[PDB]
Amino acid sequence: MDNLLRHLKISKEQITPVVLVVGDPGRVDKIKVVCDSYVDLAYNREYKSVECHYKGQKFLCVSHGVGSAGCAVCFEELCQNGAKVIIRAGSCGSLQPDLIKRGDICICNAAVREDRVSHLLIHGDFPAVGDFDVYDTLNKCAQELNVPVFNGISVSSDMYYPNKIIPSRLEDYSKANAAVVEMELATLMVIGTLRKVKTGGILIVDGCPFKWDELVPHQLENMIKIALGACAKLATKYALE
Amino acid sequence: MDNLLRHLKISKEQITPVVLVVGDPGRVDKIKVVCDSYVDLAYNREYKSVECHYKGQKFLCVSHGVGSAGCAVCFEELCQNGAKVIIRAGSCGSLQPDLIKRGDICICNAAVREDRVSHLLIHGDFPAVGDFDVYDTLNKCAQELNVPVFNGISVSSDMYYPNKIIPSRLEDYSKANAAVVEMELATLMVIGTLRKVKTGGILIVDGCPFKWDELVPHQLENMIKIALGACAKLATKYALE
Amino acid sequence: MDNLLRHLKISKEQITPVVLVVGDPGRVDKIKVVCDSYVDLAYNREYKSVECHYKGQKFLCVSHGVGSAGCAVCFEELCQNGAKVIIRAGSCGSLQPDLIKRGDICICNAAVREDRVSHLLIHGDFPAVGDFDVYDTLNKCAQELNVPVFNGISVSSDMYYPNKIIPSRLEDYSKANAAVVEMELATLMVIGTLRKVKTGGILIVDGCPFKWDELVPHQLENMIKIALGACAKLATKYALE
Amino acid sequence: MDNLLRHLKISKEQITPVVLVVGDPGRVDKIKVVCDSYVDLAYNREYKSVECHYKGQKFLCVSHGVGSAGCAVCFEELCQNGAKVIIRAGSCGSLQPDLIKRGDICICNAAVREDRVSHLLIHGDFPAVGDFDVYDTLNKCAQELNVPVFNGISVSSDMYYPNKIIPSRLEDYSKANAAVVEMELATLMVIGTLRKVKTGGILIVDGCPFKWDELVPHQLENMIKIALGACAKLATKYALE
Amino acid sequence: MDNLLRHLKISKEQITPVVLVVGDPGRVDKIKVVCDSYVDLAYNREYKSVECHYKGQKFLCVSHGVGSAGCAVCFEELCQNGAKVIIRAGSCGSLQPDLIKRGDICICNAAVREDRVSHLLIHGDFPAVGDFDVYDTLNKCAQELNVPVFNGISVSSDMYYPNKIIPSRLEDYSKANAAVVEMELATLMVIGTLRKVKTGGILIVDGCPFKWDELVPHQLENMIKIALGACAKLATKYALE
Amino acid sequence: MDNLLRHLKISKEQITPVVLVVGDPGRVDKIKVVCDSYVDLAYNREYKSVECHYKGQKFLCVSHGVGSAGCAVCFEELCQNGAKVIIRAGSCGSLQPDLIKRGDICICNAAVREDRVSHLLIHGDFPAVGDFDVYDTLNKCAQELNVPVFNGISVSSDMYYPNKIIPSRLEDYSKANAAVVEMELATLMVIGTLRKVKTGGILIVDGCPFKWDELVPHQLENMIKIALGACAKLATKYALE
């Protein structure tokens, strides 16, 4: 303890009760934009940090790059230091081609544990599940902002480029009703459950991994405001030490 | 198809939209009692079936005995035939000795997948997670009936009597924040997710597996009414074909 | 210790040296019938208990319902308390369609460990195997009562209703020469080996899981008498403390 | 087909109905000695082959060296070509230090599947179990020759020299009642079950893997004669095409 | 195909035969500095791309951020497009506290496969191994530049922050002689082997994961020049289509 | 300690710094022949031992029979007693039918860990990898003796005779670029890494496991001399205590 965070390279007194984590640090800037005010905090490797101010409340907006071990070090440094709520806003592909299309929004409550990091944390029998509150508040912002959302189960797969040798299960989990595929959410949920952190997550359909071989920015605008609004909503309760 | 259900030995036209499943068929009778009216339907092996009527609505109350493969055949026969919502009310032991004590009530949203049946259904990377709606409605009945509840993660272990040779993980999952231990809930949740059935579950603390070596019926009364009330609440939406 | 058995709800002084366990408690009654005399002992959940008297000997007849975790608690309470021999009589489906047909009888000596409960007890490298004596005595009663039997390997699968996603192995084990499929026998055998209890089991072909998509009570009568006779035979040795 | 056996380097018309397989080819010679007459057949790598003649019957005596993949190729070439019964006589160490001591004899009926070869054949849920007949005949020769035997479960471990890093399970399986430890028997049993070959096995206690850090040839004589006598006994039934 | 690379956001005609991949894009700039000339190519998320020119040769210098799934998408986009050789220069911690200290340099030839991405590519029985040539050339640059190096096995663990519940194996692999711990190298090696790409890697000791609870830039300078020199050396062979 | 080696039945003062291990003890004799002088040492079970003298140096030539557990006891007794370098010369089948044909020679540097013995030693995440030096010296003898060699990855499978039930992976590993299939090399490499022993291996193509259903002795002569020459080369460094 002194002025730590090893990877975020921010201080432990800059960690707020609520955090919004995204993957691409250029989108920390596109979110920076719609807020009321901000404080840029640090930019180390894939990890751009920032104090966002929206509707009377402050909360970080921090990016974890692509994939679970790298995202895990970010989530881990947050909870060790005092994030109470962590919502991920990001992108995903559709596992339901003709129901979930490009630009639709899912608010996901559980995910498939297809990394390895959580498995080095807890036995794979464990659920990766978000917290209901976070999931409920996120859901009603959608409804107050009059914006359709799906809800569902996401598969957090570490293989982005499947292979000719082993069965990629994604069809398996499609037939099993999972809605979307992304890379980081199971990890968030497992760490959170372990360290007592309420997590949640919302995602915009980029594409469908099944038809790779073959505007949204409006929806992108909606999704940020649902996520910003939820963080504001959720930061309220803790505001005052 | 004719007058099927192989194990429940009821008809496919007796399956309602909502079902309440418990473990012990003698408690199908203690629930039978607090309802407004009933129709006894069948009693085969561990599987006592019944049409419950409460607050203007009808729904089955069906028992699956002790453990997952046997409970699985019950849950499976229900969804194949048209249950849309299945809430389990039951008993559990505490994994948090000095916070969750005898008689407390958990409304659980996820569970550890420590059977085998779900694993023969889907890969263990999959979450066993209840549906939020079912979980929300169950939660607010508790609050309208002014009755404290915990919420949490349950471990559905198949070993009731642990052994001298292999590590029982229950301490593992305690340290991991899981609240209670029971035997059947992961299975319900996985089948449901697979067959498109909203599930949920609520449980009364019987004891603590950790201090085995060493009134509630009021709470039992509360828990039934929270579960009966939720089924009534949840059956409302489907009522009318 | 006082008047225990938690699930059987019988006393520890009512546990005999030999026990006959079946699945359906209504068949504890159909066996009750052919004996010379009986003492009904307790009926709790899926667990009907009974003192059977046949050919000069006494032995329990106790039912474990459908599936392994639930059956496991029954078997476990028996050995902890003093059953020395436990034979299961039950039903099974054929894995060999055109050799093992409806009504044939197998006396099985080993099984596939497709539960989870034994795996929480011992590593899956372990055999589930009956004891030879029990298996020999059971076999020669068949021959003294002039009644054909198959012998074989049973698969104790926890999935009764296979799925569209994962490979059910039953064809795998058919090609591997396994004779029949049931749900509880591996568990019995593993617990027994662990707690020093001789187990065995015999089974009547109900059907074939492979042609689901498409009198015996005489054989049922034979099988009970082979099992009753074996228990009598086997109880003899211990009779006198 | 012409004059095959790739590793035994004997002909397919030299394979008899019964075979006795041991590990060390120098003990094929010590068995060669007590027979009535013999025909030496081939000696390739670890695989010495021989036609034994005892009490009016002929049967091979063939050695598979140390360990399962190498033994597996031997067992496999036998069944593919027409061995109907295969008994292994060998050595083992005690897993029960103060009950099973140096020179005692076990007739084993099941084993732990701690190789890999069987697992590339069948799923590890499968039992490695001998055939009862083979096991019964072997047992009664012991009793006709007035020679004490234990019966039991053997662990067929591939690690002879355990390590400082991973848990060797041998204590695990001791606490679980397994009697002895050897290297090849599970494989025999699994292949046999797969290819429809009755197998069995008997073993003399060499030592105890647990006290490594700290006459029998009479018993060795007994064990051969129990095994020779069983092969004679068992070859009788097939004698005459 | 047109102007692809989805994550590197460079063109397929900008991919050279040799590539040097590091983790932190700020170190793509510190390497940019010691070269003779460069061409900055793209900067997308964690992925800064660059044409380096050193000793008469050109080769990319591309960064994959922290962890395997995210690094995997980088490595994958390279080989799909035509990298023939990929050397990773990075950082690691010591698994041998009192032999491998802060600032020492390992040239590693194999690694432990403690991700998940490779396992979705190939069965975990597969080695993660570098190519000998790459490893030899890297080694002799060290010796021509008169700079001590260790050689060894690296563990590519996805858990950076170990946990209170599951055994972190790092001690296990220490006792097993592994030299250093990092996060990305196994993946590189496995993808490469799969797509026919020679890989290698060299690493500077940052610290020791075992004493966390308790100048180098010279060595950092050496390591770049060993890696730059190797890439130059290795690019030579392909130079001329 | 006195005159140990339990299986090799040689003394601990007869173990040299370098050892050449082959599988078939009749090939210990065909190697015995091309040397300058020898000392026959012991012949126990599958384990023929011998002091070879070639180009001024001495080194053992010791045979481990067919398969990994049996080979493992040989390798293990060597390192425990003081072998510093162990090269295996043997045979293999081709996984690349139309590139690697009958009589070609591979010098292999890694292998697939498809035994069980190494897995009882270390976690399967571990690489089985030879040492570079051994691999380099072996490679340049080939080039000084003007004899083509492939280099590659070998699969050390324990199943020689694949089955009708489970997927043999060999096609899997072919598609993955593995060059040849044998039975013992992964074990050597893993033990060596564990006990600090440099290992290596070279192999002549006997056939192709894929076309089983359908002179070299010159190459055999070359391969021995490459292996003998390497052992001579490698023994040089240690020669003089």
Ligand SMILES: O=c1[nH]cnc2c1ncn2[C@@H]1O[C@H](CO)[C@@H](O)[C@H]1O
């Ligand atoms: O089809 C997909 N598979 C996996 N991840 C995806 C997909 N679509 C979007 N993402 C998300 O976007 C990033 C990839 O650039 C990943 O971080 C993942 O979270």
Ligand SMILES: O=c1[nH]cnc2c1ncn2[C@@H]1O[C@H](CO)[C@@H](O)[C@H]1O
């Ligand atoms: O401590 C416990 N471990 C496992 N299951 C329990 C426990 N307490 C209550 N149940 C629940 O009650 C039945 C057992 O009779 C089981 O069905 C289980 O669901």
Ligand SMILES: O=c1[nH]cnc2c1ncn2[C@@H]1O[C@H](CO)[C@@H](O)[C@H]1O
């Ligand atoms: O085809 C079958 N699969 C699985 N179990 C079976 C089958 N047939 C009979 N049983 C046996 O009967 C009960 C099912 O009602 C189960 O307890 C099982 O033991």
Ligand SMILES: O=c1[nH]cnc2c1ncn2[C@@H]1O[C@H](CO)[C@@H](O)[C@H]1O
């Ligand atoms: O303590 C033991 N562990 C493993 N195998 C043993 C033991 N004792 C005897 N054998 C048997 O003897 C050979 C070893 O030389 C092995 O083939 C094994 O079958």
Ligand SMILES: O=c1[nH]cnc2c1ncn2[C@@H]1O[C@H](CO)[C@@H](O)[C@H]1O
């Ligand atoms: O002790 C360690 N454990 C795991 N990875 C490490 C360690 N030290 C250095 N790295 C390397 O540096 C980055 C972490 O910021 C990771 O990318 C890893 O590759």
Ligand SMILES: O=c1[nH]cnc2c1ncn2[C@@H]1O[C@H](CO)[C@@H](O)[C@H]1O
């Ligand atoms: O196609 C093959 N599969 C497996 N092992 C082989 C093959 N060809 C050669 N060997 C090698 O030769 C011996 C078999 O007699 C085995 O020891 C193995 O190392």
